[PDB]
Every structure is written in C-alpha cells, then in structure tokens.
Amino acid sequence: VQLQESGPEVVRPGVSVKISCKGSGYTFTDYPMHWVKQSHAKSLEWIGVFSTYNGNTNYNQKFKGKATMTVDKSSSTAYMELDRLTSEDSGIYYCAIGGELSWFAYCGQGTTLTVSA
Amino acid sequence: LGQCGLLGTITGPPQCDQFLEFSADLIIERREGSDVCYPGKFVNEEALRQILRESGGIDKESMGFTYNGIRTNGVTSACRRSGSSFYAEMKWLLSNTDNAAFPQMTKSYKNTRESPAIIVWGIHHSVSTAEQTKLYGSGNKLVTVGSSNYQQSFVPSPGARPQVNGLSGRIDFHWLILNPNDTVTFSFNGAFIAPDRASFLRGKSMGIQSGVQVDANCEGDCYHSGGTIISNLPFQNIDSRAVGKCPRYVKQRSLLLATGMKNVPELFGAIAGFIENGWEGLIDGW
Amino acid sequence: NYQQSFVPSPGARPQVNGLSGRIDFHWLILNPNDTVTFSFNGAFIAPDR
Amino acid sequence: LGQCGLLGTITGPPQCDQFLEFSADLIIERREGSDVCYPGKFVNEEALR
Amino acid sequence: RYVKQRSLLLATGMKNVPELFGAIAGFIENGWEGLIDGW
Amino acid sequence: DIVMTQSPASLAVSLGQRATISYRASKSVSTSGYSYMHWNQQKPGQPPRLLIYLVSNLESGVPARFSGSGSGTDFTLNIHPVEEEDAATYYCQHIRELTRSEGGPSWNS
Amino acid sequence: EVEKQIGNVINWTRDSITEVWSYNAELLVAMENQHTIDLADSEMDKLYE
Ligand SMILES: *[C@@H]1O[C@H](CO)[C@@H](O)[C@H](O)[C@H]1NC(C)=O
C-alpha cells in the first residue's frame, strides 16, 4: 500500500499548517491510521495523535492540549491542523495506517515540512 | 478441576490451562477452586454456573479482532505460569502511551454456526482514578455491549477495597448468549477486557461441587458434595442438594418398610389375632 | 416510592432489520393519590396515555 | 416494634431508638412501621428482611 | 396437573381371569364372558 | 518512558556475516511465551518498512534471511548472508508494554 | 454467595418440598406398612378358609 502526504512547506512558528495523507487501497476501517515524527540528526518519536474509525483522539504525552486528529471518510485522509509551531519541530511527518501486530507497515515516504521563520 | 473452577473453563486462569477447551459428561468443582487470578467474581454468576455445567464442554472459535492502537499482554503478578502472565483467552486492551488516551473501538462478531455462543467480556474495576489514567487515559470510560437483543453500556467502579492477596483493584465481568446468525458489537474506549476465543457448547453433561476424590472405576449417577449415593432406594438422608439422577431427600433417617410380616414371638385378625403365636423354625417359606 | 435516575447505552450493535440504535424501557406501578415526577433533559420517550 | 419496623433496627429512625441494639427470640413487625424518616426504602430489601 | 407417565390406567373394573381377600384371583378361579348387565 | 539501551550504538560490518545487536529491555517483558517487539529497516533515501512480527513468524515481502531471535528479557535479531542492500539504519520501536519508544539507532554499512 | 431473597425463596421452596416428600415418605411407608400387614394378614384368610 503506497500512500502520499500533502501539506504546505512554507509556514511560520506560531501559526497553523495542515497535513493530508491519502490512504490508497481502502478506507478508515477497523485498522486506523497513526503518525510518526522525524527529528533532526535521525531520531524518532511517535508524536502521532491518531483517529480511529469511530472518531476519537489520542495525543502524545507532551502534546495533549495541543492538536486535533479526527477522521474524514470521503477522501481516505484524516483531518489535522498543526498550530503552535516552533522551529525545533522541523521534520518530515510520516503517516502510517496501522495493523499493530504485523507493524505500522502501511507507511509513508513523507512530505518534508520545514518549520522556520 | 482441582485448583480450576467451573467459571474458569471459559476464562482460563493459570490454574485452568489444561481445562480451557475441555470435554466432559461430568464436571467436578472443588472448594479451593478459584475462578479468578486477578481477583473478583462474575455478574449473575449463578446463572452462568448452571449453563456451563450443563454444556458438555466448551468448543471455541477465534473471533479475530485485529486490535489496532492497542496492547495485548495485560499481565499481572498474580496469574503466574513462568513469569508475568494472564488469562489465556482475554486481553487488557491498554493504551499506546502512558497518560495520553485510548480511543473508541467498535468490534463486531457475527455468530456463523449452528449453536448458541456463550460469550464473556471484561470491565476493569481499578483501585483509583490514578491507575486508569496510566492504564487507559483521561476521561470517562464506556464499554457498550449492544447485540440485536441487548443494550447495557457498562461502567467501572474505581474505588479502594481491602486486598485479596496482593492488589486493591478488582475485576468483575459479564456474559451474554447469542443465537445463530446474530452479531455482537463491542463499543469501548477503555477499561475493557475483550475475549479472543468465543465459546460454544457441546450438549449433555451435569456438574457437581464436591470435596472428595475421583473414582474412575466405579459407576454412579447421584453425585452430591460428599460422595455418591449408589443404591436402588427412593429416599436419602445424606444431602438435600444431591444433584444428578438422585433419590428424594427426606429428614427421617430411618424409614423402615415392613418387607416381612409381624413377629408374635413365644386388619383381618390372624396376624396379631386368633393365630396367637409366630414360629421360629421356618426359614424356607413365610 | 422509587428513585432510579436512568441513563442510556449509546453503543453500536448488529442490526435487527434496519437500525443499529435500540430502545429498552421501564415501568412502575402507582397507588391511589400518588404522584410520579419525570425529570429528564434528553433521551426520554414519555407516555401520553 | 410498633412504629419501628424490621429494617429500622439497623438504621434507627426516631421511632426505633428503643430498638437500636435489641435482643429477641421473636421480632414482630407492624403495618404502621416506617423503616425510614427521611423517606425511602432499601435496595434488595426483601433479602435483608 | 402435569405428569410424565403417558398412561396411568385406573382400574374402573375388576380382574380378568379368562377361560387382598382371595376371591378375585382366588378360589373363585374363573371370570365369566357372558355378563354385561351387572358386574 | 522506557529507555531501551542500544550498545553498541555504532557499528558497520562486512559481507556474508552474522550480527547480534541488541535493543535491550529494562522492564517486565515476559508473557505468552513471547515478546511483542517488531523491527523496521530504514534505508537512507527510502521510507521504512516492517520486517518481523512475533519473533518466530516472519512476514513475506522481505526475503526470509533475517532471523529475529530471543527467549527471555533482552532480544537480538540475527542475519545470514549479508548482501549489498543491507546498508541501512535498523531502527525499531517498542509495542510490547506501555509506552511506545523508538530505538537508538544503530548503523549498518 | 447466593442471593439473599431467592436463597430464602429456594429454602422456602426446598423445605416445603422437603416437608412435601418427607410427609409423603412417612405417609407412603406407613401406608405401605399398613398395606403390607394388610397383605400379610389377608392370605391367612386365603389360606385358612
Ligand atoms: C438455606 O439453607 C441451608 C441449610 O438448609 C443454609 O446452609 C443456607 O445458608 C440457607 N440459605 C439462605 C439464603 O438462607
């Protein structure tokens, strides 16, 4: 399953940018879709607030009152808007539809978002 | 069953792992038989205890919920096999990250067989509302079990209690019955201990609570808690809960039935009548 | 006599002929010169007879 | 019991203050016997009775 | 009142002896076929 | 959060070899006869990909010449013959017990 | 832990059924004893006359 992100790459710290990952092949079903942050100097963290197939929300620890992940069913792409931006958060955002006991294999190549003023 | 009990044959605590999917024409429950290893009881458990010891066995199928954004191995230090283990046929669906959240899951299972299922599922009565922020996540917890017949929408009781051998959190958990071509949805966003092996039935059996040992060489059908009543006699003063194909309980310990005539030793009037004496020297006839 | 304070179960289920929402509903018995109050702010299917 | 009832022997409403901690080989409940003074009943009260 | 014996036949006549006192199946050793007016 | 130790957190290796490198677990990671520890390959210039689930039961889609191994606490995969396209960064993340946390990483060239 | 009311109901029912059968068992045997001595004294008459 090949799948592509989309989102504007020129954005300021402190304003909102949206992420849009097209889920090819099938819709948001009993397998929902998560997200992963890439940091500088090649380290990861599972920042991805994800939306299940019933419309709820599960943030990271540091990022609870911080974002919103909800599902849209018409475009096979979950809805998210990333406000509050900071130049430390420059990274490539890899969407991933999960299966959780194979792995997050339905994975993305990332649209490189550079967050700087 | 030994350390296993009746209601453990569905749930499979580590004292029941050799009885998970059994077959019987007689189950035998023991006084030491814990139905539980992370402590508690069932809900309407005397109703469920009269089905499972009339089932014959417990045949199973996988349900195959592909749990996602989840964990599977909720293990605790009172269900040991080698180390941290759990019930063989349930899963603590606890969250991805510690205090983050645990979203809604809607999980369906269509019964597709000839027989009525006997499902079971779990709600987690934790000790406090600080464990159910690190196990599952902030917010209220709903487990909604709506079949075609039912609608229940359960909720836990996160209060402290005196300890049964190590922990101040409980679990108590519930059960329905399906009919062929039904479905069961499990809507839940926390505190839910799903099944993974839907349970079926096998036919005829009976079931006894007792405390004495097993004689596989003798045969009988009247099995109370202190043995087996084997005779052809219609009344017993042994136990008033003698289940099986038993005789009928009374309270007179001696009901002597006059399988011979009167003694007159040395309603018609010759037995204790004008024939005034019995005889000692007849053993061939009456 | 009573005090019950009911609450619904908004969960999904397999369908009985068309819908995935249920209703299940309750009943009391009055005695002469009693009263029944119905306090409700949603999800309530009142009687009229 | 009089104005006291059966389930008032635990709870002690003011009609039961001479029966709070009683001793009997026969208790006798009365038709006028309120088990309550701030009104209500118990839950699964026929089991406790 | 429900029972499980499908046939509980209740002896609305006496014994047949065809060709607790002892004359029904006793010293009166034979029934009679040709009486329909009385017992 | 679980801090899984990678040691060595830097190596690169030769052809046809077998390597035993550990992301080691510091918490209670015994259950079910197994651990829920998946791995992923990450090639520099490619998106990552699953390779192992449920240590014995590998996927199809990679050649099966990777061998995730272990029974106990601290786990370690094994490789047999290494080829040219092994030059990648072999992360993983944790899924077995709460919480999720990624690897070190370690290198492979 | 059987339920308090229905356990009293079962004990009301069982001890009734216990008093049903034990009255029946005492009456049956005493009826059968009197009948057995009736059918023991009867074939004195059937033998002696
Ligand atoms: C029922 O009676 C038995 C003995 O006859 C007793 O052991 C049991 O506790 C009783 N149960 C209740 C609920 O009264």
Numbering used by the authors:
A (entry chain B): 1 to 117
B (entry chain A): 52 to 317, 328 to 347
C (entry chain A): 200 to 248
D (entry chain A): 52 to 100
E (entry chain A): 299 to 317, 328 to 347
F (entry chain C): 1 to 109
G (entry chain A): 398 to 446
Question: What do the authors of the reporting publication say about this deposited model?
Answer:
The hemagglutinin (HA) protein of the influenza virus is responsible for receptor engagement and is, therefore, one of the major targets for studying the virus-neutralizing mechanism and screening neutralizing antibodies (nAbs) against the virus. After binding to the host cell receptor and being internalized into the endosome, the HA protein of the influenza virus is cleaved into HA1 and HA2, which are covalently linked by a disulfide bond. Subsequently, it undergoes a low-pH-induced, irreversible conformational change that is required for viral entry through membrane fusion. We resolved the cryo-electron microscopy (cryo-EM) structures of H7N9 hemagglutinin (HA) alone and in complex with the nAb antigen-binding fragments (Fabs) and identified the HA head-located epitope for each nAb, thereby revealing the molecular basis and key residues that determine the differences in these nAbs in neutralizing H7N9 viruses.
In the HA-Fab complexes, the densities that are responsible for the HA trimer and the Fab of the nAbs are clearly defined, revealing that all the Fabs bind to the head domain of HA but target different sites. The 1H9 and 2D7 engaged sites are located on the side of the HA head and their Fabs point nearly horizontally from the side of each HA promoter, whereas C4H4 binds to a site on the top of HA and its Fabs extend obliquely upward from the HA head. The C4H4 binding site is located on the top of HA, and the BSAs defined by the H and L chains are 770.1 Å2 and 451.8 Å2, respectively. The C4H4 epitope consists of 24 amino acids mainly from the 130- and 150-loop, which interact extensively with residues from the HCDRs and LCDRs of the C4H4 Fab. Hydrogen binding contributes to most of the interactions between the HA and the Fab, involving 18 hydrogen bonds. We then conducted HA conformational change inhibition analyses and found that only C4H4 inhibited low pH-induced (pH = 5.0) HA1 disassociation. We found a unique R140K mutation in the HA of SD193, which is likely responsible for its strong binding affinity to C4H4. The R140K mutation is located in the 130-loop, the core component of the C4H4 epitope. We found that the HA/R140K mutation in the 130-loop pushes the up edge of the 130-loop closer to the L chain of the Fab, which leads to the formation of an additional hydrogen bond between HA G144 and C4H4 S30L. The epitope of C4H4 consists of 24 amino acid residues and has extensive hydrogenic interactions with residues of the Fab, explaining its broad and strong neutralizing capacity.
